[PDB]
Design a protein around this motif. Structure first.
Motif, short mmCIF file in Angstrom:
data_model
loop_
_atom_site.label_atom_id
_atom_site.label_comp_id
_atom_site.label_asym_id
_atom_site.label_seq_id
_atom_site.Cartn_x
_atom_site.Cartn_y
_atom_site.Cartn_z
N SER A 126 0.82 -1.20 0.00
CA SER A 126 0.00 0.00 0.00
C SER A 126 0.86 1.26 0.00
O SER A 126 2.04 1.25 0.38
CB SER A 126 -0.91 0.02 1.21
OG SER A 126 -0.13 0.16 2.38
N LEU A 127 0.24 2.37 -0.40
CA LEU A 127 0.97 3.62 -0.62
C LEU A 127 1.67 4.11 0.65
O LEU A 127 2.74 4.74 0.56
CB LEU A 127 0.00 4.67 -1.14
CG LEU A 127 0.54 5.94 -1.78
CD1 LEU A 127 1.24 5.63 -3.08
CD2 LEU A 127 -0.62 6.89 -2.00
N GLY A 128 1.11 3.81 1.82
CA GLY A 128 1.75 4.23 3.07
C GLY A 128 3.12 3.61 3.28
O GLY A 128 3.98 4.22 3.93
N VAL B 29 1.45 1.94 8.76
CA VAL B 29 1.98 2.73 7.66
C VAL B 29 0.90 3.61 7.02
O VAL B 29 1.23 4.58 6.31
CB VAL B 29 2.62 1.83 6.59
CG1 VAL B 29 3.82 1.08 7.19
CG2 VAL B 29 1.62 0.85 6.03
N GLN B 30 -0.37 3.30 7.25
CA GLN B 30 -1.44 4.12 6.70
C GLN B 30 -1.43 5.53 7.27
O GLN B 30 -1.92 6.47 6.62
CB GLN B 30 -2.78 3.43 6.97
CG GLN B 30 -3.98 4.15 6.37
CD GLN B 30 -4.77 4.90 7.42
OE1 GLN B 30 -4.84 6.14 7.40
NE2 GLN B 30 -5.36 4.16 8.36
N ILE C 272 -0.24 8.51 4.88
CA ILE C 272 -1.09 9.17 3.89
C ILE C 272 -2.32 9.80 4.52
O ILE C 272 -3.16 10.34 3.79
CB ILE C 272 -1.49 8.20 2.77
CG1 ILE C 272 -2.23 6.98 3.34
CG2 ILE C 272 -0.27 7.76 1.97
CD1 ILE C 272 -2.74 6.03 2.27
CL LIG Z 1 -1.30 2.67 3.36
#
Ligand SMILES: [Cl-]
Ligand SMILES: [Cl-]
Length: 129
Positions: free
Chosen positions: A24-26, A120-121, A124
């Motif tokens: 994921s982006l995070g 990690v979310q 973002i």
């Molecule tokens: Cl994320």
């Protein structure tokens, strides 16, 4: 260029990276933070004589040519200086090959030690994506 957190998230979310190979982006924004502090111009010399370049600190023994790492492989087929551009395209495209080579994001020591297994979310959060 020193990116802002959400600014980089969006550029990364514009170039292929949200959930690339399941990450994921995070994860990507977290790795950039601790590898380079979001600075596209970061360089670091390693003890084996190779050098890490750019927002994701890509290494010259394997992935790019800086003309001073004897016996290196240039697997991304680029000069390392292209990894320092304000345009992150070259960095993102090389990172896609690195994360695909079997070991995932464990290739990045700061991700392994400071992002893996964290929330990690949060990296973002608050961004318009
Ligand atoms: Cl994320
Ligand atoms: Cl993986």
């Amino acid at each position: 260029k020193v990116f802002g957190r959400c600014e980089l998230a969006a550029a990364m979310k514009r170039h292929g990276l949200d959930n690339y190979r399941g990450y994921s982006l995070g994860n990507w924004v977290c790795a950039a933070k601790f590898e380079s502090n979001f600075n596209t111009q970061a360089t670091n010399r390693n003890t084996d004589g190779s050098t890490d370049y750019g927002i994701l600190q890509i290494n010259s023994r394997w992935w790019c040519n800086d003309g001073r790492t004897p016996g290196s492989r240039n697997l991304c087929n680029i000069p390392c200086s292209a990894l320092l551009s304000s345009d992150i395209t070259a960095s993102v495209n090389c990172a896609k090959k690195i994360v695909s080579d079997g070991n995932g994001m464990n290739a990045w020591v700061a991700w392994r030690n400071r992002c893996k297994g964290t929330d990690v979310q949060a990296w973002i959060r608050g961004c318009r994506l």
